[PDB]
Design a protein around this ligand. Structure first.
Ligand SMILES: [Mg+2]
Ligand SMILES: [Mg+2]
Ligand SMILES: [Mg+2]
Length: 75
RNA sequence: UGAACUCGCUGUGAAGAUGCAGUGUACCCGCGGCAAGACGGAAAGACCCCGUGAACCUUUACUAUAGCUUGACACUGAACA
């Protein structure tokens, strides 16, 4: 079963990672206890949309934080 | 219970005759008795064989199968050596 991890999970991956796993592990533990979700394409697009929007916020925050770093040495 | 005007003998004859041939005997009709015969009555022989019949029963007959048992996969996962 392909699933996308929610919280970080030992031996698998961190939040957002995509991993294959045995159905029974996903069905009876990881999903009920809120640790992962199926790898539905809407979902993986959801997270690709997430990874990229998060990437933009990290690129632009770095564009804002650099700007203030040029201004610190400016004074 | 085919119809009877329904005797003996010896012989003949699907080969054990009231009914055929030959012959003997016998006037017509009951009643009480007897069971030698009518291969008497009753039951499409149960023995025996036959039918490429039936059934039930047995088994190391054949073919299947419930059940019991084997392993693979599924429900069925994690960590650690
Ligand atoms: Mg007669
Ligand atoms: Mg008789
Ligand atoms: Mg008969």
């Amino acid at each position: 079963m392909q699933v996308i991890l929610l919280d970080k999970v030992a031996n698998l991956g961190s939040l957002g990672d995509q991993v294959n796993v045995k159905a029974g592990y996903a069905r009876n533990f990881l999903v009920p206890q809120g640790k992962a979700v199926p790898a539905t394409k809407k979902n993986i697009e959801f997270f690709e949309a997430r990874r990229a929007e998060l990437e933009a916020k990290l690129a632009e925050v770095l564009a804002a934080a650099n700007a203030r770093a040029e201004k610190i040495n400016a004074l």
